[PDB]
């Protein structure tokens, strides 16, 4: 299980430089290629560039002048810098492990082959919003289970995550230990320009009395971390 | 640069075979790769070097490449196969070496209907103690993905302070949405109850909550 994990600022101001890092775990940078890809809202995939573990690079011509990709084999990481951003650079950015292939279709002495690349393991994506607006961390409130949120053998309880900017926030339960039954709803964008969302977990109703449920909310752009206990 | 041409959309009924094409200019002499992107998710490699299956990819997916057309064939299509599909090749010549197709939306026709499950939460004591109040109406497991939400204070419609999301697909191929009603604690305390009323396909599910 090689895993890739993007880390970025979430919010970057117009004209400034976007900086991202991808941390590889469960495998090595060595011997592989490593790409950045982005996808602006409602658009297709745009490959930005790759880097070989040795440092050799290749870039898409459309971003070439503003981008630099680097690699750090000592930390099993690789990174991207994008200069002079505007709102056109607002997008989800992905990192992906990239493989080199060769098809030898004829005789090797006749150099009758060609090279190709493809991306086999993807990161989860990091959302980057280019905006002059200020970050705001959320308030977090418990959504208590009750006879009005039960459905026989199961019950719903949750956390309300209110008034943040920009996207995203991540919500885990019991520090990530509780995953089954977890439903984090997409955010609403309110007229105030601020987002709100709810995360709900469905649990056994018979044992609501004796179990402990805590929602962990992380909003990276504001460095907000909240743990909220949710009980009847 | 080298041009990859995909249909914007392909529609099929469950159990049928879907075919997604990628043209073309002697694409048969190149190596074609395919990616699936489900709604709200990171892309996933589903075919490489024309026909190679990555580990974990369902048997129903099959890549082929010939002449001026590469095809991704999905047999026995399921609702879960709905996604955007992109073909991709690497062009040595340049200038654009990494070419993605524009992508094809696969739509699955005639999926079963599902009425929404609705849960309504009253304001928390914590939020009230901070002099605010929010009602939270969570709507899940419905299909098709269109609903309308109406709020009532007692039996009177209320439109101010309402924020509602557009539906988005869940992991189980049905849809979810949420609606929020902002109130003052005074307003919350002054009515006998508030209700969230959800209309889907002409039928309505209503949940009510009341102070304490």
Author numbering:
A (entry chain H): 1 to 82, 82A, 82B, 82C, 83 to 100, 100A, 100B, 100C, ...
B (entry chain L): 1 to 9, 11 to 95, 95A, 95B, 95C, 96 to 106, 106A, 107 to 209
Q: What do the study authors state?
A:
Much work has been done to demonstrate that complete reversion of VHDHJH and VLJL sequences of HIV bnAbs to the corresponding germline sequences generally abrogates neutralizing and binding activity, which suggests that some degree of SHM plays an important role in the development of neutralizing breadth and potency. Many research groups have generated germline derivatives or close equivalents (unmutated germline ancestors) of known bnAbs, but these constructs do not bind most recombinant gp120s or neutralize most virus strains. Indeed, the putative germline of PGT121 was unable to bind gp120. Crystallographic studies of a putative PGT121 germline Fab, which is similar (0.4 Å core RMSD) to a previously reported crystal structure of another PGT121 putative germline antibody, suggested that the mutations from germline not only involved likely antigen contact residues, but also involved structural rearrangements in the heavy and, most notably, light chains as a result of somatic mutation in CDR and framework regions. In order to determine if residues in the variable region are a result of SHM or are due to polymorphisms in the donor, genomic DNA from the PGT121–123 donor was extracted and V and J genes from both heavy and the light chains were amplified and Sanger sequenced. Based on the results, there are no unique polymorphisms in the donor that distinguish the germline sequence from those reference sequences found in the IMGT database. Additionally, the sequence results indicate that the deletion in FR1 and the insertion in FR3 of the light chain, which are present in the PGT121–134 mAbs, were features that developed following VDJ or VJ recombination. However, the intermediate 3H+3L antibody did bind weakly to monomeric gp120 from multiple isolates. Overall, the results confirm that, while SHM does enhance neutralization breadth and potency for this family of antibodies, we are still able to observe relatively high levels of broad neutralization activity with substantially lower levels of SHM than found for the most affinity-matured antibodies.
